[PDB]
Structures are given as structure tokens and as C-alpha cells.
Ligand binder design. Structure first.
Ligand code: NA
Length: 248
């Protein structure tokens, strides 16, 4: 069965992270949309211009409204963006796939799993942080090479160095905004795809998020780093096909 997948990147990244997965899924007859969020990819805005998590999410929210059902795939921090889109348009979503992602729940503030990630005490190495009138971050080259892309082909790490941009977790926004609702986000089917060699979201942290808000299905990507759409593209495509077969 074929589906329309909507691929959503995390902080500091863009649509380009899907450059190998997208044509592979299209070769199986799926429709694929790979978005740049605000101030991401080649979007013209700068991160200092994005004042709220809603503004950051705008390209996904606009796309969801303009839909003529889709399977959302949120990577890393993109899990928060697809949770927000699901809270708004649950009827348009066949399933939400959380790919080594921050999966929020409905019982706690949206900031909950980001705070729990901070509790992991991640080693940011050469990442640079700053503030604007929100904390922003520019991921370090060594940080990305060792903590995110270490099982990726060298050329994918080269794309990351040429294309990653300043980003933000909008932690204060997430902490003060309303909890995601049981009627919206809480109503949709969820899939978590975890990687067992992830060096920034430890597998134990991915498993904690799974236990904290049990999804309908769970897949392990053996040998995946944090970037399985780059390091494990074929394996990921097979998992997404099964997800389309299950929920379409
Ligand atoms: Na783009």
C-alpha cells in the first residue's frame, strides 16, 4: 500500500537530510513531502526572527491546512513539530512516526521530554550557543561527526557541515504553552523508530520515551546512529513501507 509521507527535520537541519530517503520512497509509489521549517534549510528567515515555537512550525502547519491523510515522520526535535501538527489536524494523519525523536505526551508540559533530554547531560563539544531578544545553537563540526553522523557516509557529514544552521529548542515556549490534548495529539496512531547506536539520544533515553507514552508499534534500527535516514536508508524505507501497509 502507498502513502503520502510528510518528512520533518529537527533543530539546525533542513529538508536535505531526507535527500536519500525521499526518492527511495517515491520509487515504491509513495508521495513524499520534505519540508524546511522556519529559518531552516534554504528558508529565508533567520532564527533571530522566529519568536515562538508556533512560528518555527509555520511551514508544517501551513502545509497541513493546505492538504487536499498523511503519515508524518518527525526526526529528532521534529517530533515536537509533528505533535503540534497532530494536535491541530488529527483527522489528516494516518499515523505519526517518531524517528529517534523527542516524543511528547499529554500528561506533562510539551517541554517535558526536552528537559529529560537535558537530564541525559549531552556532551555538546564544539557547539556554540548564544541568545537573542531564546537560546540558539550552532552545532559543532566535531559534535556532529562523533555524536550524530558517526555511522553515516563521509559525504553526508560533509552536507551537514555545509548546510546546518542556527537553531533553537524554544524551551521556554514549550514549558509555558498548553499541554498537547488527548483529543488531538492523543488520538492518533504513533510509531517509534529507535536506533541502537545513537550517541546523542542514548537508546535508554529513546526507550524511556517509549515507556513513558506507549506507541502502537516500535521498531529498532540496528546499527543506526542519530541520522538513520542517512546511515540506514534502505532499512528505514522497509520499516516505513510496513507502516504504510499497517495504517493505510
Ligand atoms: Na529545501
Amino acid at each position: 500500500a502507498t502513502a503520502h509521507f510528510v518528512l520533518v527535520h529537527g533543530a539546525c537541519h533542513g529538508a536535505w537530510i531526507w535527500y536519500k530517503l525521499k526518492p527511495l520512497l517515491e520509487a515504491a509509489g509513495h508521495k513524499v513531502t520534505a519540508l524546511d521549517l522556519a529559518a531552516s534549510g534554504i528558508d529565508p528567515r533567520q532564527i533571530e526572527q522566529i519568536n515562538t515555537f508556533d512560528e518555527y512550525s509555520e511551514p508544517l502547519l501551513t502545509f497541513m491546512e493546505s492538504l487536499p491523510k498523511v503519515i508524518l515522520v518527525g526526526h529528532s526535535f521534529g517530533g515536537l513539530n509533528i505533535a503540534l501538527a497532530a494536535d491541530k489536524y488529527p483527522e489528516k494523519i494516518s499515523a505519526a512516526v517518531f524517528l529517534t525523536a523527542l516524543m511528547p505526551d499529554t500528561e506533562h508540559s510539551p517541554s517535558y521530554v526536552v528537559d529529560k533530554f537535558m537530564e541525559v547531560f549531552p556532551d555538546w563539544k564544539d557547539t556554540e550557543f548564544s541568545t537573542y531578544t531564546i537560546t540558539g545553537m550552532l552545532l559543532g563540526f566535531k559534535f556532529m561527526r562523533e555524536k550524530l553522523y558517526q555511522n553515516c557516509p563521509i559525504e553526508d557529514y560533509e552536507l551537514a557541515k555545509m548546510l546546518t544552521r542556527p537553531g533553537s529548542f524554544f524551551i521556554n515556549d514549550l514549558a509555558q504553552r498548553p499541554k498537547f490534548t488527548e483529543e488531538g495529539y492523543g488520538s492518533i496512531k504513533r510509531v517509534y523508530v529507535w536506533t541502537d547506536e545513537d550517541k546523542i539520544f542514548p537508546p535508554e533515553f529513546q526507550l524511556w520515551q517509549i515507556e513513558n507514552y506507549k506507541p502502537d508499534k516500535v521498531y529498532r534500527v540496528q546499527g543506526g546512529d542519530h541520522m538513520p535516514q542517512l546511515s540506514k536508508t534502505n532499512e528505514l524505507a522497509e520499516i516505513l513501507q510496513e507502516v504504510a501497509d499497517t495504517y493505510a
